[PDB]
Design a protein around this ligand. Sequence first.
Ligand code: NI
Ligand code: NI
Ligand code: NI
Ligand code: NI
Ligand code: NI
Ligand code: NI
Lengths: 566, 566, 566, 101, 100, 100
Amino acid sequence: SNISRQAYADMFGPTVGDKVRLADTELWIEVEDDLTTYGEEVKFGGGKVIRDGMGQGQMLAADCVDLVLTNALIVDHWGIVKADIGVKDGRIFAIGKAGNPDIQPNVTIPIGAATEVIAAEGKIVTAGGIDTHIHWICPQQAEEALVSGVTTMVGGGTGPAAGTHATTCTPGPWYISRMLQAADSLPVNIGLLGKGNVSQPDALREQVAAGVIGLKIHEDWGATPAAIDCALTVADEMDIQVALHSDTLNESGFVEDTLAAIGGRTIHTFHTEGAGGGHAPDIITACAHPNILPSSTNPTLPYTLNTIDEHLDMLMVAHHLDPDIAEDVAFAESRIRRETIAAEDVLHDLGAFSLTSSDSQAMGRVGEVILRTWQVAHRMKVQRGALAEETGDNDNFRVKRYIAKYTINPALTHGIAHEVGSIEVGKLADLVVWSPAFFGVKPATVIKGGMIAIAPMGDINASIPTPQPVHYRPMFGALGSARHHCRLTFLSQAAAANGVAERLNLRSAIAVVKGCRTVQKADMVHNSLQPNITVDAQTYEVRVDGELITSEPADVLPMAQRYFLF
Amino acid sequence: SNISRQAYADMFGPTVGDKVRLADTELWIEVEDDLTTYGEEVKFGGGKVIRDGMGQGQMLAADCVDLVLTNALIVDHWGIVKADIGVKDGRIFAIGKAGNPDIQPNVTIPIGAATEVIAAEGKIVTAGGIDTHIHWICPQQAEEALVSGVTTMVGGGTGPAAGTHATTCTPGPWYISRMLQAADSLPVNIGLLGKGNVSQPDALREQVAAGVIGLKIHEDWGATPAAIDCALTVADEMDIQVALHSDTLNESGFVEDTLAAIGGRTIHTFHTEGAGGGHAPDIITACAHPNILPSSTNPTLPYTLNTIDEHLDMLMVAHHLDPDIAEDVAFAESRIRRETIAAEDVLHDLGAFSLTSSDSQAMGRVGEVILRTWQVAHRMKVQRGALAEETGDNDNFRVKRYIAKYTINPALTHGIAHEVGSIEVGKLADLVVWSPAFFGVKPATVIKGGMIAIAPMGDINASIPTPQPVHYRPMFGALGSARHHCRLTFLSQAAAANGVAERLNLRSAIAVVKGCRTVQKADMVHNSLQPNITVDAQTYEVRVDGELITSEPADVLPMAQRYFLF
Amino acid sequence: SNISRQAYADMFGPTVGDKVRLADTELWIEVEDDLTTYGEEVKFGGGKVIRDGMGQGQMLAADCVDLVLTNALIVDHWGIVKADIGVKDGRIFAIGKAGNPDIQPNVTIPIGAATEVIAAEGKIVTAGGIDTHIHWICPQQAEEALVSGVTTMVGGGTGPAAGTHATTCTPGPWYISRMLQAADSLPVNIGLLGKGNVSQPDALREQVAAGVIGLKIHEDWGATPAAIDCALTVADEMDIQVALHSDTLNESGFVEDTLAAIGGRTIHTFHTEGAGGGHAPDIITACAHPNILPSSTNPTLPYTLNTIDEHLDMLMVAHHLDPDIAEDVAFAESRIRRETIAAEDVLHDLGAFSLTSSDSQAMGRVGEVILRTWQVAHRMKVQRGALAEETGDNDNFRVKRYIAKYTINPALTHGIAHEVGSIEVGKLADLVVWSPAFFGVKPATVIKGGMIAIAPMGDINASIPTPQPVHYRPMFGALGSARHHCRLTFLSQAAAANGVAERLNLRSAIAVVKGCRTVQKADMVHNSLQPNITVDAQTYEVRVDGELITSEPADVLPMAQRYFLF
Amino acid sequence: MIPGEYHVKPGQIALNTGRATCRVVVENHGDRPIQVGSHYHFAEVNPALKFDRQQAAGYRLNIPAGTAVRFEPGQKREVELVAFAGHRAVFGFRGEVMGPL
Amino acid sequence: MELTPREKDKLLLFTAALVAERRLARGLKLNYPESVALISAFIMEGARDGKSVASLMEEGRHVLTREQVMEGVPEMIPDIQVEATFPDGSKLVTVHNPII
Amino acid sequence: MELTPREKDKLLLFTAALVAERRLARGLKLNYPESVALISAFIMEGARDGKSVASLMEEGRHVLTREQVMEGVPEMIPDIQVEATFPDGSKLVTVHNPII
Ligand code: NI
Ligand code: NI
Ligand code: NI
Ligand code: NI
Ligand code: NI
Ligand code: NI
């Protein structure tokens, strides 16, 4: 028959041309396409469509999906579309039209007796976030991140030890082995980074052979040209990634010397703006190079009225610096610059910076990677208007550019994009379901490897799952053996071949990293700009092609006081 | 020598002829028998009886029990007696007189060096409850149920997914395998139900072969005559049980059509009163048939002043119904009838309904199965007086009839009575110890497979275990490998033979279901009545042999505000 | 160059001759030695010493430590010295000077790429405590103890059962096996005690062969001369320890009869003062014998104004005694004597009592063993002044005598000193880091087997680990397989040979007890005094060589109200 | 500003376009209400509903997916049906076809 | 006290409401979590007093008004649900559109 | 409410501060944990009010004086740090030598 558009949206979620506001920001997305056949949408419930002989077919388990997310509004780097999502064997099976081919047309995702249903009508579905700057200071960080919508965590550490407080390094075979074993207990995919600060190759090869998927070069362990060259030489031969925190003190040379030491080899530069570490005051100029994959940590995102004030003491504790030692306080101050902090936001909007990350408990907030990425987008739309790439009256392109920063780009940078990072067929089913009013702030459901791992849950004894108090609680996907089956422990190709998984008796699924040496700035989705950027040595002013890059500090931000109790 | 009866009761608990009030209800139980020899009771403590050469003998571990519950007042379907309970190898060894045969007479439960002691004098001991209507919406439900005194949970689900929110189904081999693995982490015996709504037998056989012990037929997945017949055909060949939630909409036929489709084959009808689902308004007439094992879910137990008011919105959320869609609200209302809700209480008192269950977080309260069963008994005694079967001035028979509803009957219905369900020799030692003042409300100790799994525990740093705050905390029986050894994962005979336990690498003890097809209404302990019941199509009045069945709503109930903080 | 002593202390912690106050007590320790080379101290952080080519060398993992604790102030039975501590393979590698031999002198602890760093400058490091009087009433006790600084727990129990409430016994093979399995889940080293109250040797041998490392003789199970002799005979042949709680009632004989039954064989006497159990009123006279290793439980330590008042009701609940039964209350009172409680403190100060323990939740506080040991030291210094052994103006000797009470002595007494008990090369790296202001009260870091297991942790989402609320949370060392690798389950030599670990499929590291029969009072470090002590049968006065031993009750104690919220 | 608000463009959606339809008069002769879902094979509904079951063969209600039509006892009304698609194979319901058509 | 998991869970709700109560008292416009907690705790006390489910379903819509909460909050709360022990046992109170 | 782990963690801090607040009110000299909790909770409410980080870094040094706490306590607290949601998101407030 016929149905009005509003009534339609209320029943099945929005369709082509409808717009949805992201949380309480000024960003609006418009549905670009809808893969359904009007009148044939599948809906579950009392007397609905998904029932025997109707929306559910007679096929065996092998011929139908294990899980279907009905009427989902997908937001990914490749599009903003309405479709059903089929999951089979813990992986994304298809994005299309679900149902029973026996009575329905255009069915690409068959529903059968073996199919579970998650109703996504009116909800936005995204890939799970990937944070590549984790300091394993405490295990509780994994739950915090999972709850925020982050399903993969790459970093290093051994617990609350001075070395880990300051750097993302899991030093040596013994600690690496121990942390790989401990990782089986966490409900997120994990990959470890070893200490790359050494001028003896074999000391690095041992760590890679033990299991790390990358090497962290940190100034606290000596970010010298010799150490940098050594780590990159080993990375080139073992197909692992190098993450850099440069020499802020300019002790061994200036930024141009470090860049020269890198010699055009692939490298991921952490907190490229500089507040979190790096040649003062021009480490930000690294985003101009083709071999540099640049990321920001989150406390400087976005530039607000209280940003500068909180940074000094945060800096000190994170790096074991003494406020009574003049040289210690002078180098802390040389890292905090209003000029580079303001420019960073714009560089993200332009696609010059390609990733966002936390820098958990070492000048960063583990549960705020996604939230802050969207606050930057909002602030940039408000200040700069539409991007040159926008088409139509929506912010679709800006949304695709920013979502890529914490999903596909981090995946490409670290060689794990073949497993996770986006909603594409064959990738692990790490999905996050959001209600539009809480997008980027508080998820409705977090799915790991095809099983729900954490979600808001009301009174356990209640007659329904909705009564208060409603707060995040671990689900079956986070339990014992089911967890092992639904998470991945990433290893280097050498570790995988050496039988590290068998030796340590790792219980989780194993994935191997590859393609870390061949990625370049041009490969970063929607964020491949290489600007002719300069930093004034005296004033710290950032300029691109001579024009001054800057922005204004926010006094109030969305996704803040309206959602949190504290 | 001689001792007064009161002093005797204070030291060893009550004896033959003494009566005890159950919590704050009007139900009184009278000790029917005492298996001790006066003067030879065993008591543990400083300078007491259980000491080397005295109440404790010289036998090796093989010749004595591992655990003895001294001076327990047993309340089970077969009797209300005073006796010592011996547990050996995680199973009930004997019910009799404990001690040392070397110096004591009539000893049937030998105490030796290898024997632990639990002092039960003044306490009531019962079998662990069995809830056969679990919606695995979240894992936290297991702790809630265990704390209430329920040690076995049968149901289906995959977490907080729409399908599980509405139905007790773990769809297909992949999800079934995942949930069987997750079950090892829970401190209760577990059996899973698959989705039985399909008209293709092989799609059902796969699920049974994967591990489910039963199939749930639910109207939300289409409770049609074709699906019902298919599920029963497979159940008949694989020795598994079928649980039914009929077609409320009368879409495929009326109750007589469903009954005809069942064709005299064994089936467990969930929430037979109808509020939780079923042909409107006469699904309750199913309790008249010999092949139907009828149960109630708990929100309608017992009929109270606020019952009706809370049901509408509870109904909606549980079944993903739209309050704006007229047809959705009309079918919700047709399920809520004061007439059938009031009659249900009486039918339980008469033994026409044989089981009580929760319907956890899908129109039911997981921690209130036991509590509500006793509130119904209380309300029935208050309204109808003594049962025709009572002998003596006590409520012993009514107590045996009601305890059978959440212990032995659910066990028989699902084919697990050979393992659990009552305190009889050879059954798993799942026992619950209660203080009379808190009977049915808050247990003193919950024992799983011979090990205490949860109990109230005071200040951990205190000088004794009693100082405040006292609240339920997991004990050794709920920890890692000890838990695995003390719980059972039930499988279908086909799964057991296929080596599912070995393939999934299940760590817990395995038990197989059997005898699901041969149980009939006549086999339900103390609840085998098949009344000539009718429901008036217009008025909804329930009549048995023409007489109107009804009851009055309670304004205040026992086991309520006197015990709970909220 | 030159640096002032104060500035030096602020940067690297105190050095030779500097004194430090222990918490808020009157005890002061003076640094006896410093193993560093002034100017070559290693410090980690931004632009510090531990960096590639500088304080960090080029050696492979095999040639450097996994972890280094820099500039630590060690307090152990052998000395109070300033030094770096190297840990390799989960064990103490060396105590010396850390760094890079390539550019630094006197390096004995090489730091390389595989080395993690814990900054201990300004902190005190001690061995993990060992509590040999645990009642396994609940598993939560392990976290409480770990947080207090205790890393090894020896005791017995099966959970909140009457037998365990009263005695430290894990009765028989079945319960022993179950508890050994459950132990893998706890973050502390564990050894179990079986029930030694039997006059049939084989019933004891079975328990030892099943896995216990000792036998508890308790009066509640009958502490008769026959049972005592039997347990000691088996202990002598299987190399396990016997812990005794004598016959308070003097039912089978007086203290001289029990001592005669022991016949000069090695035995550990629990709560030798008597309040926790033992021949009334002279069990305390046992500390005069060479074969007796005497310990105190903590509620009577130290003698304070409220001590007596709290003891009666505590006694009753712990031993299942009836306050209405006159004989029950008379024997409770005969155990509480101001005279022996006051003398106990002095006997500890003199070295007549060699160990302190809790008696967890059975007349003892699991989280207060360390704290109370120091309160006794404080009260003794305040009342008696310097010990005859003190040299210099410090309390160094009294500190070494008291720390030995909960570290090395308990280790020697139970045959586990080859694995734990002190900071010596080759022993498991169970270390506790303390800030001087919180010494003995709240640790800064608790290390188990080379991995941090628990520590104070601030806001998980914070930019640094220090923001409020800061409270103790489990770290990686307490997680799954990493935990198994970092803890020890102690077994008897017979159990180890029988393959108990393989049979029960124990996951943790296994250690075997040995040398339990050969330890004597003379072997207790700094606590080997055998005084000619007498107790007046009528007045209960304690005398040593005729002189009256006594002390005054404290009205206020350090390490109390200034640190705790409740 | 309303968090997560929709901005639905005005208009209507045409359902099940390009498919055969037919109208049928149905009457509930039972004493209890009957409610039929959008995708149920109309020809196999509760036997108490009287209509031309032959005309309804291979058809379902032409209403938005997930909705229903209720028939109180004695109620008579005309409904519009739309033909099944896909393989046009009917399995389940009252088991009257269990195959193609 | 022998507190079950559900009783301890409700203590979290009660405490969340104390936070909101103090802020409302200072004259602040409540945010989303503060509003849900305040109205929820109000209902739980109503049940402790012995009020009927019907009465609370109504009274709950008069705890906070649109002028006492932040913009968008009323639309973020289409309804509030909470269970508590009434004199006749546990019952579910559903308050539709609590803030107007 | 959908409370995240961090929100629930802060409820612990808020409750710890209620304990201290009541004791300070009776006229007791606060101990170490009571002092840290009281000043911390003060800052969190300051952020809820919309005060700047700079203002709180100053105001926090005037919540408790040396005469309101036990001996040695001021020296046990060289600084206090706490984060809260300001109008412009989460920020860290560091109060050096809060008690004087
Ligand atoms: Ni950095
Ligand atoms: Ni970092
Ligand atoms: Ni149902
Ligand atoms: Ni149900
Ligand atoms: Ni004792
Ligand atoms: Ni004891």
